Amino acid sequence: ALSPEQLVLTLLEAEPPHVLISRPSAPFTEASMMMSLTKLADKELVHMISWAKKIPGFVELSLFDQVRLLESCWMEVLMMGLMWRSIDHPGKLIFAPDLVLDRDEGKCVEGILEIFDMLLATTSRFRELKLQHKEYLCVKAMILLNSSMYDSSRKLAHLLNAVTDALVWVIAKSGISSQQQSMRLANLLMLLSHVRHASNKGMEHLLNMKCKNVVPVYDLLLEMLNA
Amino acid sequence: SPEQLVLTLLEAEPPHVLISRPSAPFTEASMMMSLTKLADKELVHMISWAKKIPGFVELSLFDQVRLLESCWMEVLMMGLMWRSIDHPGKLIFAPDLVLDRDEGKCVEGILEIFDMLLATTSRFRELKLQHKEYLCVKAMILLNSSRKLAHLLNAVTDALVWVIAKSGISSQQQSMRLANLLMLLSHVRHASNKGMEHLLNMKCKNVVPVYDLLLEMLN
Amino acid sequence: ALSPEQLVLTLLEAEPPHVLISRPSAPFTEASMMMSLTKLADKELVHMISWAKKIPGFVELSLFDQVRLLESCWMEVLMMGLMWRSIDHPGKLIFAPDLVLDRDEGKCVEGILEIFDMLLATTSRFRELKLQHKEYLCVKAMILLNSKLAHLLNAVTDALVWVIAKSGISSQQQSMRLANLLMLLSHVRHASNKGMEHLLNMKCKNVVPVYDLLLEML
Amino acid sequence: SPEQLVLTLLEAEPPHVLISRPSAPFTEASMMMSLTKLADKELVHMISWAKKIPGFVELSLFDQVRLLESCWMEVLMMGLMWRSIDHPGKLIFAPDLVLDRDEGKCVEGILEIFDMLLATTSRFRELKLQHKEYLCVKAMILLNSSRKLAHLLNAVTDALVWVIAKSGISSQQQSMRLANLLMLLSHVRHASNKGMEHLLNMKCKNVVPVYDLLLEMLN
Amino acid sequence: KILHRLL
Amino acid sequence: HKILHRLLQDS
Amino acid sequence: HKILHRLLQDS
Amino acid sequence: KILHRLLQD
Ligand SMILES: C[C@]12CC[C@H]3[C@@H](CC=C4C[C@@H](O)CC[C@@]43C)[C@@H]1CC[C@@H]2O
Ligand SMILES: C[C@]12CC[C@H]3[C@@H](CC=C4C[C@@H](O)CC[C@@]43C)[C@@H]1CC[C@@H]2O
Ligand SMILES: C[C@]12CC[C@H]3[C@@H](CC=C4C[C@@H](O)CC[C@@]43C)[C@@H]1CC[C@@H]2O
Ligand SMILES: C[C@]12CC[C@H]3[C@@H](CC=C4C[C@@H](O)CC[C@@]43C)[C@@H]1CC[C@@H]2O
Structure with a gap:
């Protein structure tokens, strides 16, 4: 078993990498922005599984429970990561080092602007709360x-x-x-x-x-995505 | 003041909306009418409960409608789970409207939601959620x-x-x-x-x- | 077969992710700074293999060729990536987003201070040339x-x-x-x-x- | 000036250093003995060759020694590869000191360097490295x-x-x-x-x- | 109109 | 779940 | 050469 | 030493 600080340090060393994604040379459209975000999400999913497998005891869970947890969480964890990356840049969403989307840029994708304003709103709250790095690790x-909810x-x-x-x-x-x-x-x-x-x-x-x-x-x- | 706030929420508690089963067996539209008629009746009492919360009437009018816009279904499901906290496998929709899990096999899709409501009720029960706790959370x-x-x-x-x-x-x-x-x-x-x-x-x-x-x- | 455009674009979509490493709580000791860099290199090396397998034709070689190339180059590719991350921050090496070491911080590990000034010198030459992101892809x-x-x-x-x-x-x-x-x-x-x-x-x-x-x- | 610079490079080409093969077979101390003396004599002419580079003397004393310290092994190996370009399998260390690769076994670890010198020599051979191209590269x-x-x-x-x-x-x-x-x-x-x-x-x-x-x- | 009146 | 199962069982 | 051979042969 | 004089030319 591990101590609370040992668990935190274990979470730190399990941190997944920042997936690199660049904007297209052509101006953004609905088809190409959705392409960029899904490509980013598809690559980040790979690192997430290796991250979850490094959380103590997670692999001791049954394979059914491991699968069920990742299906339910993956969009939340990815969204929580994007928000940590964007915490110090109000108005911008730092999807990747070279993919910084200003709030108004989501107008090209149908209906993505509401989710952009949601993500920015909660990011600002985490900002005003001054979310620490170690707290972000536990929260994730x-x-x-x-x-x-459902040895x-x-x-x-x-x-x-x-x-x-x-x-x-x-x-x-x-x-x-x-x-x-x-x-x-x-x-x-x-x-x-x-x-x-x-x-x-x-x-x-x-x-x-x-x-x-x-x-x-x-x-x-x-x-x-299936389910 | 926590003591004074706890009592105020206690006295602001809404009543219990009454409703019963259709005598004919439940169909994928009769249960839809029973729960929507309940929710409609619960909604009227929820606004009265919200106004009794200290400071809620002092909020802006647009701030009030917005809060009820996104919370009303959360609050209704939360009160339902508290009513069902002592009854495993059951949902106290009303004192006379008590359904089992397998009744959710009727209307399309409501079986998936009932299982979420029952499992959250299960979690609240294993934690032994107290009455004054449920008031603060709601x-x-x-x-x-x-x-x-x-x-x-x-x-x-x-x-x-x-x-x-x-x-x-x-x-x-x-x-x-x-x-x-x-x-x-x-x-x-x-x-x-x-x-x-x-x-x-x-x-x-x-x-x-x-x-x-x-x-x-719903709009 | 690919064109120069598609080759550069495939190299663009094969870029490895940035490994995250944090400065330790205690002040940097020679053993701790060496621990942070070797952990950083160990993690970066996993993604380099995935990056190298995406180079058009690299998987067509004999296994011994793919091995021998990675044995001889893996360090050069890691420092080249490091110098690109540090191209806009003189006097600093951006080993990781949360591992930014000033030059004089190398005076803690014996021998590393001379190696740090080399990377910083080469970084400055790449910065004076205004190296483009597309050129950096081909060079790597x-x-x-x-x-x-x-x-x-x-x-x-x-x-x-x-x-x-x-x-x-x-x-x-x-x-x-x-x-x-x-x-x-x-x-x-x-x-x-x-x-x-x-x-x-x-x-x-x-x-x-x-x-x-x-x-x-090693 | 391009044409004038290449001409000045040729005029500054160092003379060949005269070294001979020992009578007895090469021992580890005798092979290193010959190569180190040859490099010593080659280092004297290189300094003279470097001083003839148009503008080298203009550099500061620090820049002058720093360039010669950091490069002198590269230039000697470049010159050796130039002498062995038309002769495969052998390293033309000197007109009389001609060494096949297999002779490197006389010294522990030199073979790996010998194969590196020869492999890169063969590439310059494949590219048909012209004389004047070698003067520029050097x-x-x-x-x-x-x-x-x-x-x-x-x-x-x-x-x-x-x-x-x-x-x-x-x-x-x-x-x-x-x-x-x-x-x-x-x-x-x-x-x-x-x-x-x-x-x-x-x-x-x-x-x-x-x-x-x-x-x-070396120090 | 109803929710605005009930408030 | 072919990919998810494989990625959970390897190293 | 344990991991490298494994990494070069996976995805 | 020697390189200083060899360059002193
Ligand atoms: C899911 C969407 C594409 C993927 C986007 C998501 C918003 C935020 C993030 C986090 C980022 O790390 C990966 C992409 C991801 C997960 C978008 C909201 C609407 C769009 O469909
Ligand atoms: C909204 C549904 C009808 C109304 C149901 C809801 C589940 C839980 C509750 C809370 C209860 O207080 C009123 C009915 C209400 C609000 C159902 C989920 C599916 C169906 O559409
Ligand atoms: C190799 C050393 C440890 C690893 C260091 C290297 C300097 C630069 C880099 C690149 C970076 O991406 C990983 C660490 C890496 C590869 C260091 C120089 C001295 C020390 O031995
Ligand atoms: C430096 C070594 C002695 C000197 C050798 C070198 C291989 C090639 C050359 C170039 C030649 O012009 C002089 C000897 C010189 C400079 C050898 C490699 C191993 C041994 O230490």
Whole structure:
């Protein structure tokens, strides 16, 4: 077993890489922006699985539980990563080092602007809360472990409580009062509902783009998109 | 004030809407009418409950309608789960409208949502959700759906932490309990989105006559 | 077969992701700075294999060729990527988005300070030349193939020429820019040689515990 | 000036150093003995050759020694490869000191450097490296060995293009040849680094004595 | 109109 | 789930 | 050469 | 030393 700080350090060293994606030479259209975002999401999915496999005890879960968790979480984790990358650039969404989308740029894709304003809104809240790096690591691991409600069951609840105690430990290290610690903890996990909402809306939006044949989902992204 | 805020939410609690089963067996449109008629009746009492929340009437009018726009299905499902917290495998839709899980095999798609509602109820029950806790959380759903609002959501958060501390449990366990309770907001929001997707296709496929508040809220 | 455009575009869509590494909590010690760099290199090496397999024709070679090329080039490609990330930040090496080391921070590891000034010098030369992102793609692929192979290495060279031709400068300046970029390869190979001697020395003294794929490339 | 620069390069070509093969078969100490004496004598003429580079003396004393320190192994190996271009399988260290590759087994670890010198020699053989192309490339080495030196290196570069342009091949083949040649510079650099790694090792193992110019540069 | 009146 | 299962079982 | 051979033969 | 005089020419 691991200590709360050891779990945090383990999460740190498991951090997935920043997938590089460049803007097309031609100005953005609906078909090409959806192409860029899905290509980015399809590449990030690969690194996410290796990230989840490095969370302590995750591979001890049954294969059914590992699969079910990643299907439910993948859009949330990806959205939470995009938001951490964008936390210091208000008005911009840092999808990739060379793919910085200004808010008004989403007008070319049908209906993506609402999800852009959602992602930016929650990012600004994480910004005003001054989300620390170690808190972001716990929050991301909590997103995966808290995604679906349904021996491997006992390990899952132990897994969620360990990350939660790690987050409580990280907040306790900050030195603020015990009442400020409870308030900070509450303010952080209240945004989990906003992230799940952005995930639900983005999930529905991408399913329409795939249904209208606007974007071609391929391999990993296609496998997850089913359901 | 946490003590004073807890009581105010207690006295602001809505009544219990009454409804019964169609004598003819449930069909993919009779159950749709029963739950939409219930929701319509619940919606009227929810606005009265919202206005009784301290500071809600002091908010802007556009801020009020916006909060009820995104929270009303979360609040309705949250009250339903609390009504069903002591009844495994059942959903206390009304004191006389008590359905089982397999009844959801009727209307198309409602079987998937019932399982989410039952599983969230299961989680709330294993945590032994207390009455004063459920009052603070349900108020959090409304105030956390989308300046004076930040004063309300904060103070309500002090109330839930105050209530949690009333149990006299370890400080680490109080943080763990608070985290486990607020972690379920994401599941209440999820079922709310999936339900909003369901009721929308029931009106488009013409299976539910939506009227009055519910038709205005579904818009 | 591919055109210079499609070759450059395939190299663009094969770019490896940026590995994330953080500065340790404690101040940097010689063993800790060596730990951060070797961990960074070990992770980057996994994605380089995926990048190298995407170079058109690379998977067609014999296995021993694909191995031998990666054994001889892997360091040069890592420092070349590092210098591209550091091209706009003089006096700094952007090892990772959260691992930005000033030059004088190398004075903690014995021997590394001379190697840091080499990369910073070569970075400045690439910055004074205003190296283009499309040229950098061809150069990295050429570093791999200059460690059927003559055809693939000619195809990437053809693409780099095609990129320089698309800038519109005079035909002399195209031959001049080509030569200027090609000569910095020697300084990159030099940095790789001097950098490899430092790592193997650090390894035999057991200063840094290297592991797995970084161990196997040594 | 291109045509004038290439002419000045030829006029500055160093004389051949006269060294002979020992009567007894090569031993590890006797092979290193001959190669180190040969390099010592070659180092004296190179300094004279470098001082004849148009504008080398203009560089500062620090830039002068730094260019010669960092490049002197590259230029000697470049000269050796030039003498062995028309003779496969052998390294023409000197008119009488002609060494086949298999003789490198006399010294531990020199074979790997010998095969590197020969492999790159064969590539220059395949490209049909013209004489005047070798004069340019050899001067680019030392200039590219890390303001005044910049334009200096710029002139030798323009000259190499003129020697390639005089061949009459296509403009696309001009860029191809210019790229094939300059890419082999990194192979000359690689050979020099491994060769220095061997000579310091050979000196530190006390296998060969090093003095005068060779010891000065090696330190 | 209904929700605006009920508030 | 061919790809997801394979990526979960390897190293 | 354990990992390299494995990495060169996967996706 | 020697390289200083050899260049002193
Ligand atoms: C899912 C969409 C494409 C993929 C986008 C998502 C918004 C944010 C992100 C996070 C980024 O890391 C990957 C792409 C991803 C996941 C978009 C919302 C609508 C569109 O369909
Ligand atoms: C909205 C649906 C009818 C109304 C149902 C909802 C599930 C839960 C609740 C809460 C209860 O208080 C009123 C009915 C209400 C709001 C159902 C999900 C699918 C169906 O469309
Ligand atoms: C090789 C050294 C460790 C690895 C370092 C190298 C300097 C530059 C880079 C490139 C970067 O992408 C990974 C680390 C890497 C490859 C260092 C120089 C001295 C030390 O031995
Ligand atoms: C440097 C070594 C001794 C000197 C050798 C070098 C191989 C090639 C050459 C060029 C020739 O002109 C002089 C000897 C010189 C410079 C050898 C490689 C291993 C040994 O240490």
